[model samples]
Every structure is written in C-alpha cells, then in structure tokens.
Target chain A: LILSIVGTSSGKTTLITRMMPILRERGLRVAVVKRHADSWKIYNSGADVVIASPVKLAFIRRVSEEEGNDLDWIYERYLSDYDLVITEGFSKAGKDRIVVVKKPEEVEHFRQGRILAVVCDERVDGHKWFRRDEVERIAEFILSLL
Target chain B: LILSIVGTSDSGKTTLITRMMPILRERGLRVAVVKRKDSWKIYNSGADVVIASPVKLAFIRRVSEEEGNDLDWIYERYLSDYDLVITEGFSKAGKDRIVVVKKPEEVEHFRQGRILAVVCDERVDGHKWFRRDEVERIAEFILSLLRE
Candidate 1:
C-alpha cells in the first residue's frame, strides 16, 4: 500500500506512468483504480447499440440468459493483474493513497490520516509541511512501504 | 471497426496495436486504445490465484461489454464524432471484430469477417503485403477504402 501526495500540475500522472515500469519489474501485481463520476455510456454506438440497448434492458430484468453470461464474462476479465491498485483522487475513500497537493496550506487535510508522504514542488512555510527534500525522498519511502 | 489482435507473445500483436490507431482515426473518428496484455493478469503470492482466476475470467469476457460500452459511449457522447469502431484485440466467441492479418495465424481463428483491413509490420518479402508505410500513411489509405 505505497502512497504519495503530489501537487496538482506538478506532473502527477506523468510520474505515475513512469513509475509503472519500475513497479512491474518488482514483480508487483499493479492494478489502477480510477475514479470516474460520469455514467457508463462511453462504449456503445449506431444500430448495433439500438439493438443492444433493449438487449441490455432485458439483461437488467434477468430475461436473457445468454446476455447475462456475456456481461459476467467481461467483468471478470478486467479484474486481472497486479497487487498494487492506484487511484488518482480517491483520497477520502479510506484506502491508503498519496495526495497531489497544490497550495501549501492544503497539507492539513491530507496530513491527518492515510497519507504516507507528501509530494510538492514549491517552497513552504511550516514545520509540518514537507519541503522538496522530504518529498524527493518519496520513492525510497514508497519502496520501504512496499 | 477498431480491432485488437490478441494472441500469444510475438504473434504480431504490437504491429497491429501500433497500426490500427491511425487507420481508424483518419476515417473521421477520434480513436483511443489500450495495449498491455500482461497487465491484465495477476500472479503474485497473496495474489490469491484461486479467488483471482474465476474473477479474471469474468472480467475478460466483459471487456467486449463495459469497456466496449465505455468507448462507444465516449464517441456517442460527442455525437457526429465517429463512423467506425475498432478494438485492437478482444476476440472471444460472440464478439465482433476486424482481424488485421492475412490467412489464419492461429487455430482459434474467428470467422466473423468484420475485418476492415489486413496488414503486416514490414513488407512481406516476395509477397504483396500491406507495408508498415501503409499504417504510417493509413489516413490516406483508409480514406480511399472508406470512400470506395
């Protein structure tokens, strides 16, 4: 459960993508769990969709045995891989995570609990707030956590 | 349609994943795809191989469902955005796809025939092949075929 706290626009995603290869080399099973608030409408289209939607409603009503098998099969495939699951902004979900911080003062919100380390790119004016040096030590800290 | 070429390692999958993106994007659709077959499997101790395997089997079958749904919804969410769909590889029986290879490379070959194009990584020596250059210039090639 390695966690990090990074400042927004401080290249959080770029950092994570870069870290993936290294994490994989560790033989770690890494699963990324992203938080999407939007509804599930992104994977359908055209007449096929016009046909599949009714089939889907039938699925909701448990009317199509074949479609139910198809739906279950697809979900099982996605849960594959990795021990480490990373999420972008699921901070308060009670799962351990690193927060990406921008304003220095926002540290208090993350500092109280599950934050393993802070990742920031600017100078700060407090003892509790981590400086760039403390944050640079993040990789070692995460490795230690792992 | 965007087709994903799924097969054992070194079975020409990288070539296909790299090639199809441009071909479909050129045909007036904004296309995005994923290519990490190994990432979809978990095999570490405490990995719970027992609990994980059946769960995984369930998830792979759904790729043709929800992930398929998510991408489709993204395109439809921006209506007037696309005309064709392509996934690099997710061929289980009952899934429709465009396989981008000539002849049957494996015994698990699907006969759906939704194939939009057949391609190769480099020019197949002594054979007429869809060269890598075709994928680089895929926009032109796709526009030409789609128009026809």
Candidate 2:
C-alpha cells in the first residue's frame, strides 16, 4: 500500500486525481482508500452502505467503537486485487508515503525516513520534492517505486 | 427511477423504508436510497478527502450551515446508479410523490395530482393508498410506474 499523507487542505486530492489517470494510462490497476474523520456519517448507525453505478461504486461501513485501528483487515477483505493501493489519510499506517506540504511547519510533523517523495510548491531540505505543477513527474516517481 | 415519499413527523417514513427494502431487493434490481435529514453529518469538520478504488469511490464535502438546499445538484452529480431513488422530505420540490397520511384530515394538506400514491395505516380515500403491511404490493405498484 502507498500512502499520500497530507495535512488539511494540502492539495492531496488534487495531486491524486491528476496522478490516477496518468497511472491508469500506463495500464496499472489502481485503488484508493480514504479514511474519514469520525464525525462524517456515510453509513447509518447500524448498517453498511454500498452505492454503485455502471462506472463507479462506493462501500461505506461504520467503524464501531470496539473496532481497533489496524487497516489490514480492510485490505485483506476488499482490496487484494489491485496492483496499487493509494490511501489518503491514516499517517500512522506505516507505509511509504508521499507527503504534501503547503507550510514550512508541516514538514516537521512527518517522519523523514518513511517519506518517499514530497509534493510542494516550495522546496524542503533533505527530501525528493516535486512542485504542484509537476504532477507528471510525481506520477513517474511513484512508478519507479512500484 | 425517482420517487419521493414524505409525511409529517411520526408519519412512518422510517417504517416505510424498512418494509420496502426487502421487497425491492427480491426484484433483482439495485436500489439507491437517499434520506434527507437535517441532523446527519454529511462531512467531516476539517479537510477534504476522496477515497476510491477501481470498483468504488466516495467523496465527502462539507455542507455549511448557511448553504441552501439543492437536491437536484446532488442527484445530478452523484447517484447515477440503480433502478430506483426514494427520497424522504422535500415536499415542495414538485416531484411526483408518495405521500403518507395517517389521519384522514391530512389528505387535504397535499396538492392533488402531485401524489402518485399514498401509504397509511388508515384509509384516506381517492388516491392509491397502501397499508403499512402491504409493502410488497406497494413495491410492485412502484415498479409499474417507473417507466414514466
């Protein structure tokens, strides 16, 4: 699993939306898992929801209070078929991450060793960085990691 | 593929949805339901995230407290799947609706001809009325009307 670890409003979705189509064009089957904050209500209290169309589908399940934080069960149960799994949150998931930094202070929060690349408007020291406009290059870098 | 059912508080909207679920599922058609409630949290307090995979995708957007209601925009943007869409509330959107009237007096409140059907425990006369227990029959009734 690859992670796109980001701070709030850090262009995480913007980068990934651009990156996904490019990767698909290269014939890679990609999947994305986005972790929502606790307050968002996708599923009703006691039920799971599956919404589907010919082109898109969504699976939403309530994480009960007793549920542990590990995401391995989710991957094993639902996402084993994809060649690439890109996750949008859960900074602690312990995977190679592409950190998107919009502010100088944001770099301090991320663990340096686990970060594979940084997507930013400005350069940060001691990191493989790509500017926001260089989505093609960022996609290329991610492919190399694969 | 669009149907709206509405009634005032305690008029059995929840009970109606629960009953219709199984009957529709047995018909071999997928159904997407949207219940519009004022209290549910549709978005997180902070940040924007879209989680998706090849067969699935979810997009959550924060609806501000001051934002106006635009159910049309939501249906156009999302909810492209399934053979049915049953909406609760929005009595004034001018969609053909299934109005639930528990008491006979409530029948006068709805605009005539806008109602496609009525579901109630008590008889309200004139419009097509389905008892709360006759949900399977009501499901069949709805399927017949879908091509229009």
Candidate 3:
C-alpha cells in the first residue's frame, strides 16, 4: 500500500493534499513520507535520543546518505502500520510511482517502467494514466488497489 | 526512579529477571523493556524519524554521546509511566543496582556504586543475603522498597 508521487515542480504535494479528504472519508489511515533537509540540531542525551511527551514519542538515529534514500527499510520500521503510504520526492525509490507533469511533454522525463499512474492534464489513454483534477477517480483506483 | 540489575556476563542478570517479572506481575504492575534496535534512512538536518498521525506524533533523532548511559534520561524521557523501571543490564548506568552472581568475585567485578542488594547462590556466599533459591524473598524485598 505504498506509492510515490513524482514530478519536478508539478503539483505533487498539492494534488496529494486534495486527494486525502476523499481517501480519509473511507476510514483509512494515511501516512506520508517526504525527504527532509539536513541542518537541524538537537541536544543529544547520550548514545541516541528518544523525545517523549504525554502523547507522543520519537526515536532518532544517525544514517548515511545512501541509507537515507533507501525507502524499504524506512517504511518497514516506520510507515508499515498505515493503511496507505504516499511518498513525496523520492523519485529514486523503486516503489510504483504516480508521476505528475506540468505539460504532457514532461512525461518523457519520468519514464520509469513501473509507472502506476500519471497525474497529467492531457492523459488521453493508457491503463495507468489520470487527469490532474480527477483525484476522486485516482483515489478510487488507489483504494481498489489497497 | 529506575533500578538497573547490573552484573557481568553469566552473573545471572537475565536469570534473576526471568523470575522477577512474574512476581511483579502477581503484585500487579505493567512493564516495558527498552533495549534498542535500528536502521532507517534519516535525511534530515533534524530528527532521523518523524511521524504524525491523527492521534499521535513521534520524532526520533540523535543526541550526542555526552551522557554515557541512557538509564536516567530514558526513565525521565520515556519510561516514567511505569510504576518502576527495572533495566536488564547496564553495568555503567550508576543507578541503585542488584548484583547477581555465580561467583563471589563477580559481585566485586560490578563494584561501581549503590550496590543496593546482592543475589547469589546460598551454597556459594551471601552477607548470607538472599540466596539463589531466595529469589522470592528478593521479589518480596522489592515490593517493600516500592512502599519506600
């Protein structure tokens, strides 16, 4: 139940945001993973740190850049509990991707053999294609797959 | 407060713990063990892992090795919910400890601080504190300390 939302400068996050309300209506728990930037600091508490609160807990670790791009290990440890896992900006990840495009011409840039659905405006044909605004259909397709 | 059962390998930390849990359960207490595990690709200048659900949020990140052992910080930061936190074996954690031993000198091997109690074979030694067969008394003693 994992899929990557791909496309540079496309409305990837925006489209995913719009698609959520409908998916959530079906009583589904959604989890999203997006690449994070490096440059945040925390006061360490020896070995490693687990930030704990009344209603929250977070466990942190150090990892290499190669491991950071590895989606499978991250998902297994973290997001496997969700009903659906949508990833943003993990273009290199091997998960089935829903590629978004600003123009139909941009399709050539995202030609992965494992494309799930293309969220473009002028996707006329293909089993795995969609219009940007037809998120309900896309969500239904995702729901059916899940 | 958290108490670590400290000892060298084969000194019986796990053996003593296997008996203590059921007794603590009989007296009614919830428990959690916080040994660690890993491997997640964390691409953040911040925390290594972050999760936000409808009812929960989690942030996992790294802290420097300044505090050598996590016994106290773990108690305050996370395990504070338990009635008492009993750590398995962190010999360096500098907490009140129950040293379990097969040999008398193994007790001295873990001679760091706050040797609150000793557990050993009656045939071997004691102050004759609790013997190896006297694990039940040790469990009973812990309940008394809880009342402390």
Candidate 4:
C-alpha cells in the first residue's frame, strides 16, 4: 500500500528512517517518495539524469507540479516493485497517511478518518498510535497491514 | 530499449552521451543518462536519499555490489520511465554498446556482438563507426533502432 507520513513536518523523515530497516529486515522491499518545494537540480543533458555509483544510484528527472503530485503514476513508474511505498508529504493528496508529531496535541489538528496510524512523542488515546521513538511497535503495526 | 555509450573503451563516454541527448530530445524523446559517481543528510540512517522538486527529482541509494551491478534492477526501479536509457561504464551489463576511444588503435580492444558501433576521435574502418564529432549520425543510428 502507498502510505504518507505527515507532520511535525520536520520529523516526518525521522519516522521514515526509523521504519525503513524494520520493514526491510522482515523482507519487505520499500520505496519512499518525498516532496520538496525546492531542491538542487542535477545537470540534465537529457530529459533526466542518473548518477550511478557502486553503492549508490541517483536520478534527477523533470516533472510539472501537477504531474509530480500524482501518487498513482509515481507508484506505477517508480514504486510498484516495492512492497510498500512511503511519502513524506502529500498528506491530503497522499490520503493513507500516518501523522507523526512532536506533541500529542498536534494530533488533533491533523486527525482524519483515513489516518492508518499515528506516531507522537507523547501518549495518545482512542487511536492506533505509537510513541515517537517506539519504532519497533510502528514497524509491527506496518507488518500487520502488509 | 537500454543502450550504453561506454569507454572500454571515459575516452569520450560522457562526451558522447552528452552530445547524443539534444538530438534525441529533438524528436520528443525523453532520454535519461545513468553514469557512475559519486552525498547526504539525515545522519546515519543508512537509508537511500530522495530529494524532489516539481521540476526534478534526485535519489541516491546505498547498495551492495550485487544490488548495484544489477543493471536490470537499476533500470526497472529508476529508469524504466525513460524513452531510452543511456549509460556509461556499464559496458558489460548493457548488451548494446557504443564503445568510444581516444586512439583509433584502442578500437580493437573491444570486440563483440555487443559492439553496436565504435566511436572515436579519429576515423577508423571496417566497423559500424562514428567520429566523436558526428553526434548527429550517432543520434540517427539510435533513431533507426527506435523505429524498429
């Protein structure tokens, strides 16, 4: 499934980085999609650029805002091979999201019917949520869904 | 199709690939160049980094040699979206290759069915060849393959 990890906004990737290994260890191939308002553009001699390495392979490609926003197409083109696809932003358009926050109160502002899970620094109630550092439990929650 | 403009031949691997792009783009083809090299954030997460913008997206994934050399996996995961994938230094992995050389004598170092063409700075004979400056003909050759 495609999952989006939303705010503290700043700590979203911290959650993703925490969750990545757990899924990979259980033998799930995961892919991540992130959004940036601005980023360094690689020198694209063609339509796209791929900086391949012995231990790293990077690609830079062009897309319009509308085209870049489509999760479905991004999945088909780049994420389908993985068992799970996680996005850092694209909360609304990203639909099935897990709201990660530094404060328990932040959850109220971010809640939605579609939140698959929540990760917060403090304890929360009436929802399937985990502590910010309780990545093991978060991994377990993801495992159950997959 | 995935093709490589290699230097068994760096003699002109990047030079040739860079030259080929605009001509390919002229026909409305979306081409992608995949080459070696060599970055970072998020401390020691041991995770792949993907930085995105509406105009472009870049990712750098840490890989084991087995994973790194799996050209098919590389192509499918990140490059399958391109109209054509042109790579450098992945000569052996890409079955169709254009071997480039600085010295005409270096052409004989590469001999194979994989040798789709030989590119060099000076003229050479007895092979499908392109001078480094004749990028248009090289582009036309790839176009012919695309037609097929």
Q: How would you order the candidates by TM-score, starting with the best?
A: 4, 2, 3, 1
Error of 1 at A104 (Å): 1.6
* Per-residue alpha-carbon lDDT of candidate 4 for residues A25-108, written as tens digits (9 for 90 to 100): 888766666767601221556557776667776667788777676767666766566787767776657367788877777877
Stretches > 4 Å off in candidate 1: A2-10, A38-42, A45-81, A109-113, A123-136, B1-148
- All candidates' lDDT scores? 0.40, 0.60, 0.61, 0.70
- Which 10-residue window in model 4 chain A sums to the lowest lDDT? A38-47
Model 4: how far is A41 from its true place, Å?
A: 10
Sorted on lDDT, best first, the list reads 4, 3, 2, 1
lDDT, candidate 1, A78-136, per-residue tens: 33333555544434445555655666676667553465555556655543234443423
- Local accuracy of candidate 2 as per-residue lDDT tens digits, B1-148: 6677777643376566656766776776556555541001111212223443333334433443322245464455444555776666656666678888677677666663388877778887888888777877887888788755
Pick the TM-score winner: 4
lDDT of 3 by residue, B34-148 (tens): 3321113322212134443322234453444543245566665455556666665666766777887766777777666677787777343443357667778887887788878
Cα shift from native, residue A129, model 1 (Å):
6.8
What is candidate 3's lDDT per residue for A43-139, written digit by digit as tens? 1211123443433345444445555556676677566656887777666666788888877677666665367877877753563778889888988
User: Tens digits of per-residue lDDT for model 2 on A1-146?
Assistant: 45555654638767777676778788776656576541123233222343433323334433432232445655564556556767766666677688887865587687733887777887777888789889899989888877
True lDDT of residue B25, candidate 1: 49
Write one digit per residue (lDDT tens) for candidate 4, span B1-148.
8887766536466666777778899899978766661014332354444556677666656678777787787787777667887776676674687778877777665654277888876777777888788989999999999889
Q: Write the per-residue lDDT of candidate 1 for residues B108-134, one digit (tens) a residue.
A: 364443434445453333323364346
Alpha carbon lDDT of residue B95, candidate 4?
Answer: 63
- What is candidate 1's TM-score against the reference? 0.35
Q: Regarding TM-score, does 1 or 3 come out ahead?
A: 3
